[PDB]
Amino acid sequence: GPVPSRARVYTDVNTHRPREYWDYESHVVEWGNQDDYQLVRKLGRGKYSEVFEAINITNNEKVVVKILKPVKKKKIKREIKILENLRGGPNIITLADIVKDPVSRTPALVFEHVNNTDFKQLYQTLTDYDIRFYMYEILKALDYCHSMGIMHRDVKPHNVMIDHEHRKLRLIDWGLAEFYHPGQEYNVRVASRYFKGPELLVDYQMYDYSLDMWSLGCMLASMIFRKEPFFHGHDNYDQLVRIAKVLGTEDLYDYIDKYNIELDPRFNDILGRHSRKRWERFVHSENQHLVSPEALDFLDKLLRYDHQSRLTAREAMEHPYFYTVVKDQAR
Ligand SMILES: CCC(=O)Nc1cc(Nc2cc(NC3CC3)n3ncc(C#N)c3n2)c(F)cc1N1CCC[C@H](NC)C1
Numbered sequence: 001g002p003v004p005s006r007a008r009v010y011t012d013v014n015t016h017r018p019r020e021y022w023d024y025e026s027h028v029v030e031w032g033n034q035d036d037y038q039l040v041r042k043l044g045r046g047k048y049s050e051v052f053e054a055i056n057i058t059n060n061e062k063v064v065v066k067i068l069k070p071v072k073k074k075k076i077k078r079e080i081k082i083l084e085n086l087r088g089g090p091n092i093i094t095l096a097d098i099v100k101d102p103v104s105r106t107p108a109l110v111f112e113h114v115n116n117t118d119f120k121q122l123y124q125t126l127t128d129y130d131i132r133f134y135m136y137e138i139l140k141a142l143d144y145c146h147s148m149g150i151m152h153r154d155v156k157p158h159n160v161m162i163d164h165e166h167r168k169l170r171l172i173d174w175g176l177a178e179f180y181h182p183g184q185e186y187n188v189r190v191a192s193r194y195f196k197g198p199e200l201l202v203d204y205q206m207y208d209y210s211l212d213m214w215s216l217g218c219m220l221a222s223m224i225f226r227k228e229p230f231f232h233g234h235d236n237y238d239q240l241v242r243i244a245k246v247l248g249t250e251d252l253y254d255y256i257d258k259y260n261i262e263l264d265p266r267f268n269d270i271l272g273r274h275s276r277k278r279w280e281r282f283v284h285s286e287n288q289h290l291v292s293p294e295a296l297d298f299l300d301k302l303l304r305y306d307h308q309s310r311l312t313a314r315e316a317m318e319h320p321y322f323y324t325v326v327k328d329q330a331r
Helices: 074-088 119-127 129-149 211-227 235-249 249-258 264-272 295-301 322-330
Strands: 036-046 051-054 061-068 094-101 107-113 158-163 168-171
Touching: 036 094, 061 211, 074 094, 119 235, 129 158, 129 168, 129 211, 129 322, 211 295, 235 249, 235 264, 295 322
Parallel strands: none
Antiparallel strands: 036 051, 051 061, 061 107, 094 107, 158 168
């Protein structure tokens, strides 16, 4: 079979907790009053939810309501517990309340409102410093949630809300997040395609927090190279090909070998043979002001096939790329 794997850090954190911390199916839900919230306007939809701006009529606070479509109650309980567990943590969205929508008898999660700048307009004006700053802020959230035994599993631009005016960032959408347990085999059908770690694409199920760091790598790549998304595959197979054409097939094959991964026979024809490319080839006059030796060192150490060898969020936070950010935060 496949070779087992444990997280390098925060390995046993959930084991040393009370059962109720991670055994979310046990979580009883205390419903708030649905009439405290009046829907203003629709903000977006998804396969499994519809998102609205609403006003909390009690205190006139703006709020964001995620009316869930029919999903497994298990997964509702799971998102709620994770949000409750993470409440107050750095750059983590606050779950303000939970109500039973009248026009669907469905659960609706009520969230803090972030006055978010649109990721099209923002990822164009971002200076080198801004990218470093906001990457540092994201890492605070990833390290915190990972230290609390949870993996987001859907890190990507659209799940990061940024109020540029107030230099304030919230990692949102915890609906795919899960508790890390050593030895557990997780679903690979998570995350969005351009952000899927190799482990997902080759069906290595015994993955961990390091998954989030791959996704962060993908984000960083696109920000510094001004290519959204950076690995732009047509499907899960081609996605791994896109990666392979950059990271090379040599390390991919070493990776499948190390963990004795059974590789879908599909892949055997389309992966081919590819050198690992030097990041300089993605550098052009238009983007160079964002690319630096530091940025490339940091990126290289996020984007690794072998999940065990990627930076941990805390290691990432210690990288030279953030030195000016860290000094400025202490002043
Ligand atoms: C809570 C909503 C969720 O988890 N995801 C989601 C959020 C938004 N919009 C915003 C927009 C703002 N502020 C801007 C108006 C000024 N804020 N502030 C806070 C929060 C939160 N949380 C949020 N969310 C969206 F437009 C689509 C989705 N999606 C799209 C992908 C699928 C997903 N559910 C599975 C729903």
